[PDB]
Amino acid sequence: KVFGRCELAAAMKRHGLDNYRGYSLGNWVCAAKFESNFNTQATNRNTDGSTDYGILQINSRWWCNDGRTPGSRNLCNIPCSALLSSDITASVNCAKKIVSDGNGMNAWVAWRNRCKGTDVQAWIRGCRL
Template identity: 55%
Template sequence: MTRLLLLALLTCLTSRVMGKIFGRCELAQMLKEAGLDGYRGYSLANWVCLAFYESHFNTGLVDHEADGSTSNGIFQINSHLWCDDLMHPSPNLCEVHCSDLLTSSLNDDITCAMRIVQTPRGMGTWMAWRNNCEGLDLSHWLKGCEL
């Protein structure tokens, strides 16, 4: 038990040190460079909207869910299916450790998000996207950004 508590504390401290809160346009540029604009039919504005409502552009965010899983990083990728948190067995469909989603580098987050939107639910996998972005005019998410 003490070991688990120490691991959880260390993970939280590490994520705060390594995480980053992106600016809206800075994030949009990075996501565009990574090829997300139009990926699986989703505009760049959809990805920016998703990141805002999931994490407020914070790569270091960890949300502890009622089922014991965690949602991690800028897209709040859940440990139940998508990443390994070392505490609960999971399919780890993105083949990544959850702590890798908490750094200022978005490579693992983007790769995993691309895998998630390949599922039949697409971006609908994220409730925050369904409730705040789906079917809406999202042009304001990119307004003023030099893309």
């Protein structure tokens, strides 16, 4: 599924990401936009044997199990295929764990490079929330 910006914002709000650990909802929408272009089926297969999965491009070395990645930790305790669903619940739950595991949003390279320091409220401007 490819989400709309406002539709994703509302979905993420319903799942409790607005101001989760001090990060406003627009940070999360911005991250998704630049990680996956709002596509729940996005996959990026890396040369280090890991794969990045779904709307937030969560990596199979530390966070989910795809059975093919060396040094797998599976800290979200989920199969990576759960991150490819049209329902974003698994991806949000795992994103919450990534921040809970001592990382801020700098765990997402697209957030660090394309959202940090910008006017992230623009990502939810005009949306019904």
